[PDB]
Design a protein around this ligand. Structure first.
Ligand SMILES: CCNc1cc2oc3c/c(=[NH+]/CC)c(C)cc-3c(-c3ccccc3C(=O)OCC)c2cc1C
Lengths: 459, 91
């Protein structure tokens, strides 16, 4: 009847020195990849009707979705950095790299099926189809999601002090941009197929960054145990089936932002059109530098599950706080440069072709949801991220869609100039997470009382 | 001449039986006897006994939610006892 989210603030003693700061260069090697994209958004500008994103962001559906599963070992493997064998911890790293290759060949297979956007029911440039050499970014770049899960099962095994990935997913991107075009139209290379061939380039570099795992059983002791990855243990082998209900819970919960896909791209669908399909140089600028935000926790997620093995019970979940809060400093000290600043005279026609002469009723949610969500997932990559607990964190987001279902058709009927108006209970559906989660992260840093079953020792 | 197998932890039970996972940095010359009873004083004592760096093991936890106190034992150099340490935290 008042506080069923327990003793709030306690996530503080003298932890001013929580240095989950390499867990920034885990998501700055993720700007590193975030940003090839634009170099082939405006790389396949050379081709005009190479709007290509037309598959390339309907591919990375069964990337980021399946990817959910995969980066769901982030605890699995950091938490057994409080065990000993990086190669039993690693015979997961392997057992999954089998997964990231095995579910990798479903990206790579459900991608096969995928190719039938020969379908129609609503609005132009989201059904239309004249010439589709999308045909081939659909495969030439959907034939990759095999190697490309294994190429994430990488930093799904940099859950233990490295980002040898900021090394590569940089000289991965650089490698691709030469490459990128030598297919769109190129040299010696297969120079022709260029609208797909920006992605035969992209996908070619997934496979190169695939062996920028292989090449980092290099700096110290092993995470190489690629002895036959096989499973079989009863009817079917876990440490794999175990990956299962960290995976489901996250993918099907990356189907949060997977209908924050069909809400957002179905309210350009009334006669809303113009500056309402400018809700994408808008919310693609959520995405843009929401990625370094959000994903400190989707990296901090180690330094919690890790310090669970290394049995520092909430000497970790009472860093889950002073990590919740530290880019929650930047949550607000850059929710300011969002409702404030614009897309001004340096915005040309890049990641989405529309800049000059449209409204800032697009900054009107660069606050609404903006830091009242910033973290309301980094509280998940710290829950899940710490524990089992995406188990129905899954059902965390069965509201951050089904609660903002009706403030879906509650802009199109709006009280105010409610361009941010179905961003109603999709900022209030979406700060019923200031609760749901960070309620189980005080039901939860309250299980490391129950678990901390001897409060201190002898000496 | 020293101090105890100096960690404490029983994480949880399997609400009948319990996990006891404590310090053991090596062993010594090597060995653990672990005491076994409530804190009731009545219900006599029993003994698990283990090897290596393994005060990190698990009990037969018979009786229900009942308070239970159980110490571990160091053994060393001298076939004697390098000190003992207990927590009481039951089911
Ligand atoms: C840095 C990420 N950048 C992104 C850039 C994008 O640019 C797009 C341009 C387009 N114009 C071609 C003329 C169309 C039609 C869709 C686009 C999507 C898109 C398309 C279909 C369904 C969903 C999305 C989608 O994911 O929307 C999120 C904003 C998209 C997605 C992401 C993630």
């Amino acid at each position: 009847l008042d506080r069923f989210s327990f003793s709030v603030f306690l996530k503080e003693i003298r932890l001013l020195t929580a240095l989950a700061l390499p867990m920034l260069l885990a998501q700055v090697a993720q700007v590193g990849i975030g940003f090839v994209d634009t170099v082939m958004a405006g790389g396949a500008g050379k081709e005009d009707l190479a709007a290509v994103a037309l598959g390339s962001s309907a591919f990375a559906t069964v990337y980021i979705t399946f990817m959910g599963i995969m980066a769901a070992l982030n605890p699995m493997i950091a938490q057994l950095y409080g065990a000993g064998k990086t190669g039993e911890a690693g015979e997961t790293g392997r057992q999954g790299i089998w997964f990231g290759l095995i579910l990798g060949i479903f990206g790579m297979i459900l991608m096969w099926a995928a190719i039938t956007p020969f379908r129609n029911w609503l609005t132009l440039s989201d059904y239309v189809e004249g010439t589709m050499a999308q045909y081939m970014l659909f495969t030439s770049l959907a034939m990759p999601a095999a190697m490309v899960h294994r190429a994430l099962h990488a930093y799904a095994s940099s859950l233990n002090r490295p980002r040898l990935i900021m090394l590569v997913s940089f000289a991965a991107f650089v490698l691709n941009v030469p490459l990128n075009y030598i297919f769109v139209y190129g040299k010696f290379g297969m120079p022709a197929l260029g609208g797909a061939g920006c992605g035969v380039a992209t996908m070619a570099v997934f496979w190169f960054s695939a062996l920028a795992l292989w090449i980092y059983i290099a700096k110290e002791k092993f995470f190489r145990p690629f002895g036959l990855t096989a499973k079989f243990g009863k009817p079917d082998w876990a440490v794999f089936k175990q990956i299962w209900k960290i995976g489901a819970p996250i993918g099907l919960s990356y189907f949060l932002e997977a209908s924050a896909f069909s809400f957002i791209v179905f309210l350009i669908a009334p006669f809303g059109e113009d500056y309402v399909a400018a809700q994408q140089v808008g919310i693609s600028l959520s995405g843009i530098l929401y990625m370094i935000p959000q994903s400190v926790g989707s990296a901090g997620t180690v330094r919690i599950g890790f310090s669970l093995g290394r049995r520092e019970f909430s000497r970790a979940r009472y860093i889950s706080g002073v990590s919740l809060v530290s880019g929650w400093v930047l949550a607000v000290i850059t929710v300011l440069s969002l409702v404030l600043f614009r897309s001004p005279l340096a915005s040309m026609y890049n990641d989405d072709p529309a800049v000059l002469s449209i409204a800032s009723t697009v900054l009107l949610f660069a606050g609404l949801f903006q830091p009242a969500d910033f973290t309301q997932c980094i509280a998940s990559y710290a829950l899940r991220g710490y524990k089992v607990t995406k188990v129905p964190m899954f059902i965390h987001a069965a509201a951050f869609w089904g609660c903002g279902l009706l403030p879906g058709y509650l802009l199109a009927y709006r009280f105010d100039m409610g361009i941010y108006g179905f961003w109603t209970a999709l900022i209030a559906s979406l700060t019923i997470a200031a609760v749901a989660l960070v309620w189980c992260l005080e039901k939860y840093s309250m299980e490391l009382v129950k678990s901390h079953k001897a409060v201190s020792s002898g000496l | 001449v020293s101090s105890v197998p100096t960690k404490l932890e029983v994480v949880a039970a399997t609400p009948t039986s319990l996990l006891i996972s404590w310090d053991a940095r090596g062993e010594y010359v090597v060995y653990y006897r672990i005491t076994y009873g409530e804190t009731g004083g009545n219900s006599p004592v029993q003994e698990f006994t283990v090897p290596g760096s393994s005060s990190t093991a698990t009990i037969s936890g018979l009786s229900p939610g009942v308070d239970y106190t159980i110490t571990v034992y160091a053994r060393s150099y001298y076939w004697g006892w390098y000190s003992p340490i207990s927590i009481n935290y039951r089911t």
